[PDB]
Amino acid sequence: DFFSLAEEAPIIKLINAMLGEAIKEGASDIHIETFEKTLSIRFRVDGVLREVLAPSRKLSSLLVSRVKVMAKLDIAEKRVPQDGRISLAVDVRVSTMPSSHGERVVMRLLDKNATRLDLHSLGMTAHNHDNFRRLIKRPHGIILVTGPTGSGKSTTLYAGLQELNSSERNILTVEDPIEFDIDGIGQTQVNPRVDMTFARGLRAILRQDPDVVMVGEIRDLETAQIAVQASLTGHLVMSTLHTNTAVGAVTRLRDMGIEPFLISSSLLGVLAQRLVRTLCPDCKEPYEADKEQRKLFEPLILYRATGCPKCNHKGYRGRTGIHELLLVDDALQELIHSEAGEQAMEKHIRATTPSIRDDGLDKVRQGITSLEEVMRGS
Ligand SMILES: [Cl-]
Ligand SMILES: [Zn+2]
C-alpha cells in the first residue's frame, strides 16, 4: 500500500506501490515534480489532477533515477528530455524533462487491451475496408502500413494478421518488441543480446516455410532487401514505414537503396493512416458551415468539440483511423520503375482513390470528428 509506505530499496517499493495505487484508482497519469521548497506527486483520474503526496524535497533525485532505470534511460543525463517504455498488463510511458529545480517525470499508464482492435473496428470506410481485406488475402507481395509515430500502425497490422490467422496459413512475425501474443501466430522478438536483429530474424523466418510474414518495421536497406526478396519468392509480407504519404513509401524505399524495378514488382499496396479523435457524442455541438468551410466540401451541418466530464481535456472521447489505400496497378508499376516522382504517382492514384484528407473530411461530414482535428494533421 502506497499510502502506508509513504508514512514511513524502499524507493523501489514506494515506486511500485505508487504504480499499483494509480491503477487501483483508475488513474491515467502520475506526476513527480520538484519545487524549490518541496516535492510533489500528483495523479490524474478521469481528467482530474490532484496532489496525493508531498514528500521531502530530498527524495527527488532518487525517485527520478528509479523511474529512469525502469524505463531503460540515462541516469547520467540530466539536461535533456528522455522517453522510454515499461510493460508491467499495463503499458506505461515515461517522460522526464529538465526543469529549474530538477527533472519532472510523468508516467502515462495505458490499458494494453484497448489498443487491441479487429480489422472492422479501425474506422476504415466501406471501400478501403473492402479493398484492404482483398489485399491481405493475396498470395504474395509487400503490404505496407505507413504514417508517423502514434498513427496506430501496430494495431492495424495485428488486426490484419488476425483476419488471416487460420490453420491453413503459417503466419510468422519478427517484432521489436512483441506487443502481445496472438495465438496461432509464431511471434519472434528482436534480441540484441544475441545479435538477433530484424534482419537475422526475418532471414530465419524464411527457412520456416511461412505463407505470411510480418516485420515490425523496415528501418535499413538490408531488412528492406530481405523483405523484397521474401515477397518475390511467394510470401505475403507486411510491414510499416513512418513516411507521411502513401506515395511517400515508394520514395523512401528508393532512397534507402531498393532497385526501382524491384519496388515496382513486389509492392502490392500502401495503407497510409492517421488517427483522429472521435468527438464526444454528449457535448458535441452542431453548427452551420460558414462559406470558407463549405469551400472544403442547402445548410451543411458539422460538429464542434466544446468539452464535458465524459471527455476531459477537449470534447473528444476515443479515436479512429482515416486512410488512403494506394493499390498497385500496371500503370503505377511503370511510374515506380521509371522513378517518375510523387506528383505523377499521386496524379495517377487520384482517379480511383481519395486522399487521407478527403477520408477525414468525409468523417467530419458524418460528424464523427471535427474539421480542426482533420485539418491539423494535414
Ligand atoms: Cl504506430
Ligand atoms: Zn464531452
Swiss-Prot record:
Its EC number is 7.4.2.8. Changing residue 93 to A: More than 95% loss of protease secretion. Its main location: membrane. Keywords: ATP-binding, Cell inner membrane, Cell membrane, Membrane, Metal-binding, Nucleotide-binding, Protein transport, Translocase, Transport, Zinc. Zn(2+) binds at residues 280, 283, 308, 311. Removal of zinc reduces the enzymatic activity by about 2-fold. GO terms for cellular component: plasma membrane; type II protein secretion system complex. One of its GO terms (biological process) is protein secretion by the type II secretion system. Its cofactor is Zn(2+). Disruption phenotype: Deletion mutants show complete loss of protease secretion. The keyword Protein transport applies. One of its GO terms (molecular function) is ATP binding. It catalyses: ATP + H2O + cellular proteinSide 1 = ADP + phosphate + cellular proteinSide 2. It is found in: Cell inner membrane. ATPase component of the type II secretion system required for the energy-dependent secretion of extracellular factors such as proteases and toxins from the periplasm. Acts as a molecular motor to provide the energy that is required for assembly of the pseudopilus and the extrusion of substrates generated in the cytoplasm. Forms homooligomers; most probably hexamers. Interacts with EpsL/GspL. Belongs to the GSP E family. This is Type II secretion system ATPase E. It comes from Vibrio cholerae serotype O1 (strain ATCC 39315 / El Tor Inaba N16961). The gene is epsE.
